[PDB]
Design a protein around this motif. Structure first.
Motif, PDB file in Angstrom:
ATOM      1  N   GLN A 239     -34.275 -12.895 -17.885  1.00 44.99           N
ATOM      2  CA  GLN A 239     -35.544 -13.593 -17.697  1.00 44.99           C
ATOM      3  C   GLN A 239     -35.909 -14.402 -18.949  1.00 44.99           C
ATOM      4  O   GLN A 239     -36.436 -15.512 -18.850  1.00 44.99           O
ATOM      5  CB  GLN A 239     -36.663 -12.603 -17.343  1.00 44.99           C
ATOM      6  N   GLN A 240     -35.613 -13.850 -20.125  1.00 43.84           N
ATOM      7  CA  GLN A 240     -35.870 -14.560 -21.376  1.00 43.84           C
ATOM      8  C   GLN A 240     -34.916 -15.746 -21.551  1.00 43.84           C
ATOM      9  O   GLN A 240     -35.293 -16.769 -22.118  1.00 43.84           O
ATOM     10  CB  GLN A 240     -35.805 -13.602 -22.566  1.00 43.84           C
ATOM     11  N   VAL A 241     -33.690 -15.615 -21.048  1.00 48.93           N
ATOM     12  CA  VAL A 241     -32.757 -16.746 -21.019  1.00 48.93           C
ATOM     13  C   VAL A 241     -33.272 -17.838 -20.071  1.00 48.93           C
ATOM     14  O   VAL A 241     -33.184 -19.028 -20.377  1.00 48.93           O
ATOM     15  CB  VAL A 241     -31.339 -16.301 -20.609  1.00 48.93           C
ATOM     16  N   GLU A 242     -33.828 -17.432 -18.935  1.00 45.45           N
ATOM     17  CA  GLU A 242     -34.420 -18.381 -17.991  1.00 45.45           C
ATOM     18  C   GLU A 242     -35.511 -19.200 -18.681  1.00 45.45           C
ATOM     19  O   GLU A 242     -35.533 -20.427 -18.583  1.00 45.45           O
ATOM     20  CB  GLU A 242     -34.985 -17.630 -16.785  1.00 45.45           C
ATOM     21  N   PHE A 243     -36.397 -18.519 -19.400  1.00 49.42           N
ATOM     22  CA  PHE A 243     -37.439 -19.196 -20.174  1.00 49.42           C
ATOM     23  C   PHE A 243     -36.842 -20.171 -21.195  1.00 49.42           C
ATOM     24  O   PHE A 243     -37.230 -21.333 -21.261  1.00 49.42           O
ATOM     25  CB  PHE A 243     -38.312 -18.168 -20.882  1.00 49.42           C
ATOM     26  N   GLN A 244     -35.883 -19.687 -21.975  1.00 46.80           N
ATOM     27  CA  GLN A 244     -35.156 -20.512 -22.940  1.00 46.80           C
ATOM     28  C   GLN A 244     -34.616 -21.801 -22.301  1.00 46.80           C
ATOM     29  O   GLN A 244     -34.725 -22.876 -22.884  1.00 46.80           O
ATOM     30  CB  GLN A 244     -34.023 -19.679 -23.536  1.00 46.80           C
ATOM     31  N   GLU A 245     -34.044 -21.691 -21.108  1.00 45.24           N
ATOM     32  CA  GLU A 245     -33.475 -22.859 -20.424  1.00 45.24           C
ATOM     33  C   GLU A 245     -34.542 -23.847 -19.943  1.00 45.24           C
ATOM     34  O   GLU A 245     -34.343 -25.064 -20.027  1.00 45.24           O
ATOM     35  CB  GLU A 245     -32.566 -22.428 -19.273  1.00 45.24           C
ATOM     36  N   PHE A 246     -35.673 -23.345 -19.449  1.00 46.51           N
ATOM     37  CA  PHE A 246     -36.787 -24.239 -19.101  1.00 46.51           C
ATOM     38  C   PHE A 246     -37.325 -24.932 -20.352  1.00 46.51           C
ATOM     39  O   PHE A 246     -37.606 -26.129 -20.336  1.00 46.51           O
ATOM     40  CB  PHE A 246     -37.922 -23.494 -18.386  1.00 46.51           C
ATOM     41  N   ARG A 247     -37.457 -24.178 -21.440  1.00 52.01           N
ATOM     42  CA  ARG A 247     -37.876 -24.759 -22.715  1.00 52.01           C
ATOM     43  C   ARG A 247     -36.891 -25.810 -23.221  1.00 52.01           C
ATOM     44  O   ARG A 247     -37.292 -26.805 -23.821  1.00 52.01           O
ATOM     45  CB  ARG A 247     -38.067 -23.666 -23.771  1.00 52.01           C
ATOM     46  N   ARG A 248     -35.606 -25.593 -22.971  1.00 50.12           N
ATOM     47  CA  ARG A 248     -34.580 -26.557 -23.368  1.00 50.12           C
ATOM     48  C   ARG A 248     -34.655 -27.878 -22.598  1.00 50.12           C
ATOM     49  O   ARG A 248     -34.190 -28.914 -23.089  1.00 50.12           O
ATOM     50  CB  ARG A 248     -33.200 -25.909 -23.303  1.00 50.12           C
ATOM     51  N   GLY A 249     -35.276 -27.858 -21.420  1.00 51.75           N
ATOM     52  CA  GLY A 249     -35.629 -29.096 -20.725  1.00 51.75           C
ATOM     53  C   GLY A 249     -36.555 -29.965 -21.563  1.00 51.75           C
ATOM     54  O   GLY A 249     -36.422 -31.188 -21.575  1.00 51.75           O
ATOM     55  N   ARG A 250     -37.491 -29.334 -22.272  1.00 52.76           N
ATOM     56  CA  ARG A 250     -38.394 -30.061 -23.174  1.00 52.76           C
ATOM     57  C   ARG A 250     -37.618 -30.721 -24.305  1.00 52.76           C
ATOM     58  O   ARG A 250     -37.931 -31.837 -24.719  1.00 52.76           O
ATOM     59  CB  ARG A 250     -39.442 -29.126 -23.789  1.00 52.76           C
ATOM     60  N   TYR A 251     -36.610 -30.018 -24.818  1.00 51.13           N
ATOM     61  CA  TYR A 251     -35.804 -30.524 -25.917  1.00 51.13           C
ATOM     62  C   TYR A 251     -35.000 -31.751 -25.486  1.00 51.13           C
ATOM     63  O   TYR A 251     -34.979 -32.770 -26.188  1.00 51.13           O
ATOM     64  CB  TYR A 251     -34.872 -29.430 -26.441  1.00 51.13           C
ATOM     65  N   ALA A 252     -34.356 -31.653 -24.323  1.00 56.55           N
ATOM     66  CA  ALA A 252     -33.629 -32.783 -23.734  1.00 56.55           C
ATOM     67  C   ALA A 252     -34.554 -33.983 -23.531  1.00 56.55           C
ATOM     68  O   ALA A 252     -34.192 -35.118 -23.853  1.00 56.55           O
ATOM     69  CB  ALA A 252     -32.980 -32.376 -22.411  1.00 56.55           C
ATOM     70  N   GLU A 253     -35.752 -33.735 -23.002  1.00 55.26           N
ATOM     71  CA  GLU A 253     -36.733 -34.802 -22.824  1.00 55.26           C
ATOM     72  C   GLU A 253     -37.043 -35.523 -24.126  1.00 55.26           C
ATOM     73  O   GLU A 253     -37.012 -36.747 -24.178  1.00 55.26           O
ATOM     74  CB  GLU A 253     -38.035 -34.258 -22.238  1.00 55.26           C
ATOM     75  N   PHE A 254     -37.343 -34.775 -25.185  1.00 57.43           N
ATOM     76  CA  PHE A 254     -37.671 -35.432 -26.445  1.00 57.43           C
ATOM     77  C   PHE A 254     -36.536 -36.334 -26.917  1.00 57.43           C
ATOM     78  O   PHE A 254     -36.758 -37.500 -27.267  1.00 57.43           O
ATOM     79  CB  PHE A 254     -38.022 -34.451 -27.562  1.00 57.43           C
ATOM     80  N   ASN A 255     -35.324 -35.791 -26.932  1.00 51.45           N
ATOM     81  CA  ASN A 255     -34.171 -36.523 -27.461  1.00 51.45           C
ATOM     82  C   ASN A 255     -33.808 -37.748 -26.633  1.00 51.45           C
ATOM     83  O   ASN A 255     -33.417 -38.770 -27.187  1.00 51.45           O
ATOM     84  CB  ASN A 255     -32.958 -35.598 -27.613  1.00 51.45           C
ATOM     85  N   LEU A 256     -33.959 -37.653 -25.314  1.00 48.26           N
ATOM     86  CA  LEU A 256     -33.570 -38.750 -24.415  1.00 48.26           C
ATOM     87  C   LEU A 256     -34.667 -39.804 -24.185  1.00 48.26           C
ATOM     88  O   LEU A 256     -34.355 -40.987 -23.983  1.00 48.26           O
ATOM     89  CB  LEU A 256     -33.095 -38.183 -23.072  1.00 48.26           C
ATOM     90  N   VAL A 257     -35.931 -39.382 -24.218  1.00 47.32           N
ATOM     91  CA  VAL A 257     -37.071 -40.279 -23.973  1.00 47.32           C
ATOM     92  C   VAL A 257     -37.685 -40.858 -25.251  1.00 47.32           C
ATOM     93  O   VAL A 257     -38.060 -42.040 -25.286  1.00 47.32           O
ATOM     94  CB  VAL A 257     -38.191 -39.562 -23.185  1.00 47.32           C
ATOM     95  N   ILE A 258     -37.788 -40.031 -26.292  1.00 50.46           N
ATOM     96  CA  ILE A 258     -38.599 -40.350 -27.471  1.00 50.46           C
ATOM     97  C   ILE A 258     -37.791 -40.627 -28.743  1.00 50.46           C
ATOM     98  O   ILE A 258     -38.086 -41.589 -29.459  1.00 50.46           O
ATOM     99  CB  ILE A 258     -39.637 -39.226 -27.747  1.00 50.46           C
ATOM    100  N   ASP A 259     -36.787 -39.802 -29.033  1.00 49.48           N
ATOM    101  CA  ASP A 259     -36.095 -39.869 -30.335  1.00 49.48           C
ATOM    102  C   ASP A 259     -35.496 -41.246 -30.635  1.00 49.48           C
ATOM    103  O   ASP A 259     -34.696 -41.771 -29.862  1.00 49.48           O
ATOM    104  CB  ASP A 259     -34.999 -38.810 -30.441  1.00 49.48           C
ATOM    105  N   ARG A 260     -35.883 -41.813 -31.776  1.00 46.49           N
ATOM    106  CA  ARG A 260     -35.474 -43.171 -32.144  1.00 46.49           C
ATOM    107  C   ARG A 260     -33.988 -43.243 -32.479  1.00 46.49           C
ATOM    108  O   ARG A 260     -33.301 -44.168 -32.050  1.00 46.49           O
ATOM    109  CB  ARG A 260     -36.286 -43.678 -33.331  1.00 46.49           C
ATOM    110  N   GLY A 261     -33.503 -42.266 -33.241  1.00 41.84           N
ATOM    111  CA  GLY A 261     -32.099 -42.219 -33.638  1.00 41.84           C
ATOM    112  C   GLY A 261     -31.169 -42.185 -32.442  1.00 41.84           C
ATOM    113  O   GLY A 261     -30.197 -42.941 -32.372  1.00 41.84           O
ATOM    114  N   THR A 262     -31.479 -41.307 -31.493  1.00 43.12           N
ATOM    115  CA  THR A 262     -30.714 -41.202 -30.254  1.00 43.12           C
ATOM    116  C   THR A 262     -30.727 -42.532 -29.497  1.00 43.12           C
ATOM    117  O   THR A 262     -29.673 -43.064 -29.140  1.00 43.12           O
ATOM    118  CB  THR A 262     -31.270 -40.071 -29.370  1.00 43.12           C
ATOM    119  N   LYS A 263     -31.922 -43.075 -29.282  1.00 45.61           N
ATOM    120  CA  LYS A 263     -32.084 -44.365 -28.604  1.00 45.61           C
ATOM    121  C   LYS A 263     -31.262 -45.466 -29.256  1.00 45.61           C
ATOM    122  O   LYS A 263     -30.541 -46.196 -28.572  1.00 45.61           O
ATOM    123  CB  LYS A 263     -33.556 -44.786 -28.589  1.00 45.61           C
ATOM    124  N   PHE A 264     -31.387 -45.581 -30.576  1.00 43.53           N
ATOM    125  CA  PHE A 264     -30.668 -46.605 -31.343  1.00 43.53           C
ATOM    126  C   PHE A 264     -29.155 -46.462 -31.199  1.00 43.53           C
ATOM    127  O   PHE A 264     -28.457 -47.443 -30.935  1.00 43.53           O
ATOM    128  CB  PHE A 264     -31.065 -46.535 -32.821  1.00 43.53           C
TER     129      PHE A 264
END
Lengths: 302, 304
Positions: free
Chosen positions: B232-257
Motif C-alpha cells: 500500500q505504501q508502494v502504491e502511494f509512492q507510485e501515485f506520488r511519482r506521477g507528480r514527479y513525472a509531471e514536473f519534469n515533463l511539463v515544467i522543468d526548463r532543463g528537460t524542455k530545453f
C-alpha cells in the motif's frame, strides 16, 4: 451574435457525451461512469465522467466543458493577438480511454468550438477535433477499419478532407525527440471555419459519430483476447510514451494547465500506470517490437 | 581566453570526480547493484557518461550523468534568452542526477552542478554556473528535512549571510507545480546565472554544493533504507511519482530545453520514475501519514 447556433452545438456535445458513455458502458458490463459536475468563477464549468477498474475499461474519461472568459488567457495571445481582449466561449467533448487488456488500443477523441465576440464585427469562430487510435498489440484489420470509418465520414464534405486531416493527425501526434508516432493515426483538425457554419457543424457531428463507429467494434473484437503479465508490462512502458506526449507536446493540455483549467479534468488523459526505463526498448523480432517497426510507420491504411 | 580554458578544465575534472564519488557512495549504500556506464558522443562536439543503476537492494532507479558538449553557435532554442551570443562558440558541462529508491521511506532526490561558457571575439567570455539539490520524500521525517536543510545552510554560510536564504527561496519557487498549487518536495538549494562573484568563488560554491548533496542525502538513505514497508505504501509512492513525472515533463526548463534542442533523450529522461500511477481526483485518505506529506511537509518551507 450566434447564440442559437451555439446552443445547438452545446446540445449536440452533451448528447454525444451521453451516447459515448452509454456505448462504452455496454462494452464493459461491470463498471459505470461516475459524473463530476464543476464550475469556475465567472468562467462556466463542465461535466467530467470517469470510469475506473471495469472489466474492459481500466481508466476512461469523457469530459464536457463550457468555458467563458472576458479577454483571452495570456497563453492564447501569441497565436491570437487580434482578439486578445475579446469575450469568448469555448465548448467541447474530450475523451481518452485506457483499456485493461493490452490487445484493446487506447483511444482519444475531441470535438470543440471556439467563439469570440468582436466590437463592431461578426464574431470569430472555429471548430476543432478528431479521433485517433493508440494500439499496443496492433491488428492490421483494425487499423484499416479505423481509417476506413474516418475516410467514409469525410467523403460527403470534400474529396481531399480525409487526406488533409489524416495527414494533420500524423503530423500532430508525433514525438519528435523520439522520432515516433503516438499511434496509427485517425483525424485531426483545427481552425475549421472555411465552410459555412452549418457544414462545419455537420462535419464535427460526423466526427463524433465516427469515433464510436471506429472504436467500439475494435473494443468488442479484442476485449476478450487472452493476455499475460508480460504484455501488461509492455503496455505500461508504452503508456510512458503516451504520458510524454500529453505532458511535453500536446497543445491543449499545456494551454489548459497554463491558463487555470481544471487540472483533474485536463489530466484524465494520463494512463493509470506507466513505466520508464533507461534505454528501454522491446526485444527485437517480437510482436512488441512490430508496433514501432511496422504499425507506427506505415502511415497508409486505406 | 587562456585563463578561462584553464579554469574550465578544472571544472571538468571536478565534475568527473564528483560523478565517480556520488556513484561510489550510492553503490556502498545499496550493496547489491552497481552503476552501468553508457558513454556517448554528440554530433557537433563532445558527449557524456550516463551511469544508471536499476533493481538494487536500495536504489530502484538511479541515474548520475556527466555531459560535456561544445560547438559553433548555440541551439535555436537558446536564441531567445541569449540572442546576443547566438553565434558564439560555446561549452556546457555538468553533472545531473535523480535517485528513485525502492523503499518509500527513502526520499527521491535530485542534484545538479553545471557551467556554461560562450567565447566572444575581442570581448571577455560570458559564463555562469547553475545547480543545487533537493529532496522529494513520500513518508517524510521532521529530522531528515531539518538535517537536509542544515547541510545546505552550513555549506552556504562562508559565501555570504544571504546565500542560503536566496537559493533556498529560489528552490521553493522553481520546484513548484502551480496548476496543483503544490511543491515538488521539501526543498534544498537552486541557483542559475551564477556569475556575480569572481569565477573562483563561484566554482568553490558549486564544489561545496556537490559535496553537500552527499552530506545531505546519504545519511538519510542509510537511516531509512531498512524501514519496513507495505504494498500500500508502494502504491502511494507510485501515485506520488506521477507528480514527479509531471514536473519534469511539463515544467522543468532543463528537460524542455534538452528535448527541444536535440539532446540525448534517454540521458535527459533518466529523471522519470520507474513506475508512476495517475487516478482521477486521486488524493491520499485524510488524517493518514500519506496525507501529512501535502498537508504539512510540503507547505512548511521553514526548516532551519
Amino acid at each position: 451574435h450566434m447564440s442559437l447556433a451555439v446552443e445547438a452545438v452545446k446540445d449536440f456535445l452533451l448528447k454525444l457525451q451521453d451516447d459515448i458513455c452509454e456505448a462504452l458502458e455496454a462494452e464493459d458490463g461491470q463498471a459505470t461512469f461516475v459524473e463530476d459536475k464543476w464550475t469556475r468563477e465567472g468562467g462556466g464549468g463542465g461535466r467530467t465522467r470517469v470510469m475506473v477498474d471495469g472489466a474492459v475499461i481500466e481508466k476512461g474519461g469523457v469530459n464536457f466543458s463550457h468555458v467563458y472568459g472576458k479577454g483571452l488567457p495570456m497563453s492564447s495571445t501569441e497565436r491570437h493577438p487580434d482578439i486578445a481582449g475579446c469575450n469568448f466561449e469555448a465548448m467541447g467533448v474530450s475523451l481518452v480511454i485506457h483499456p485493461k487488456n493490452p490487445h484493446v488500443p487506447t483511444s482519444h477523441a475531441n470535438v470543440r468550438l471556439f467563439v469570440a465576440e468582436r466590437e463592431g464585427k461578426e464574431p470569430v469562430w472555429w471548430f476543432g477535433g478528431g479521433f485517433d487510435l493508440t494500439p499496443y498489440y496492433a491488428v492490421e484489420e483494425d487499423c484499416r477499419d479505423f481509417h476506413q470509418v474516418a475516410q467514409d465520414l469525410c467523403k460527403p464534405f470534400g474529396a481531399d478532407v480525409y487526406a488533409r486531416f489524416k495527414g494533420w493527425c500524423d503530423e500532430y501526434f508525433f514525438i519528435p525527440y523520439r522520432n515516433e508516432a503516438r499511434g496509427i493515426g485517425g483525424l485531426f483538425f483545427d481552425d475549421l471555419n472555411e465552410w459555412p457554419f452549418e457544414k462545419c457543424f455537420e462535419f464535427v457531428q460526423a466526427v463524433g459519430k465516427g469515433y464510436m463507429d471506429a472504436y467500439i467494434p475494435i473494443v468488442n473484437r479484442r476485449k476478450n483476447t487472452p493476455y499475460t503479465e508480460q504484455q501488461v508490462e509492455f503496455q505500461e512502458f508504452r503508456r510512458g510514451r503516451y504520458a510524454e506526449f500529453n505532458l511535453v507536446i500536446d497543445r491543449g493540455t499545456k494551454f489548459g494547465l497554463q491558463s487555470g483549467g481544471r487540472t483533474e479534468s485536463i489530466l484524465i488523459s494520463l494512463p493509470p500506470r506507466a513505466r520508464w526505463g533507461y534505454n528501454w526498448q522491446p526485444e527485437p523480432g517480437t510482436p512488441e517490437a512490430r508496433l514501432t517497426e511496422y504499425f507506427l510507420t506505415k502511415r497508409q491504411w486505406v
